[PDB]
A paper describes a structure:
The protease plays a crucial role in viral replication by cleaving the polyprotein into individual nonstructural proteins. HuNoV proteases are cysteine proteases structurally similar to picornavirus 3C-like proteases with a chymotrypsin-like fold. Their active site features a catalytic triad with histidine-30 (H30) as the catalytic base, cysteine-139 (C139) as the catalytic nucleophile, and glutamic acid-54 (E54) as an acidic residue which orients and stabilizes the conformation of H30 (15). The substrate binding pockets S1 to S4 in the HuNoV protease, which accommodates the P1 to P4 residues of the substrate, are in the cavity between the BII-CII loop (beta strands BII and CII, residue 102–117) and the DII, EII, and FII beta strands of the second beta-barrel.
Author numbering:
A (entry chain B): 0 to 33, 39 to 101, 116 to 122, 136 to 161, 165 to 172
B (entry chain A): 0 to 34, 39 to 123, 132 to 172
Write the structure that this text describes.
Amino acid sequence: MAPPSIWSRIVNFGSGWGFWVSPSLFITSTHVIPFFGVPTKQIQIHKSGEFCRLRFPKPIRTDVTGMILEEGAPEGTVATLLIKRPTGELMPLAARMGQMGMLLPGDCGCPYIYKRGNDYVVIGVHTAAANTVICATQ
Amino acid sequence: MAPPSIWSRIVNFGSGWGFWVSPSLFITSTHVIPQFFGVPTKQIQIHKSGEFCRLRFPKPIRTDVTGMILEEGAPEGTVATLLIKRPTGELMPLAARMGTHATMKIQGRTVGGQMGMLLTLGTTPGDCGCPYIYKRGNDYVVIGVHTAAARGGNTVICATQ
């Protein structure tokens, strides 16, 4: 259901994963932050509570289109937790959810997506789980 | 292009990449082999046919994937898709018109494989190990692995067998 281009946005970072919103915007969780060739000082790091945004002065992923990132998902939205594993396996997981989710480590940082019209929407990143799941917000 | 499950079979293997044809079969390029997947190099059944390296492991490692048809190249004129992954994460499916088998010198190294040509950015040595794939009905089919590329040309070599 999620095309390869959106999977390619998910890239391993630190101890887990992160996600490309644009050629220059990259989101992840704070527990995986130990950058991509760019000095750690030439980046905007705006941590926001187990959620972190990284903005580079130059595009890094020019292959990637600008995708909408919202705070969360309206209650009842069936988001999709796109977990990647070190072996290369892709693990899509249907989550009912806007901040806490019900399914139907090193995974933290993987994004939450839900399709609205002919365009995808990011709503946060994987924070922790132990059927329960949690999604970090802006 | 191709679905995610096919792309997820492509993984970094040393200097370049490799391809999980089945849960236990792993094709790659002999030159990208590091100097595997948490397995003793002795325990792995290695086979080589030029710059083509086929690794059959004793235990199914990649249980998420399925078996896929692996063939010795493709007939002349077939348009295969070289599935390139770059270390930045980007995906680059490139169409290639497979030609005949040839032998050439590149980087002080005599290379052999099924020549192909990229059709309307370009390949890099870090891209070796990635698969040439063309769909035959419903079945996706692997024909070999990227092993070399001409200095300036769009000629490309596909390790076969």
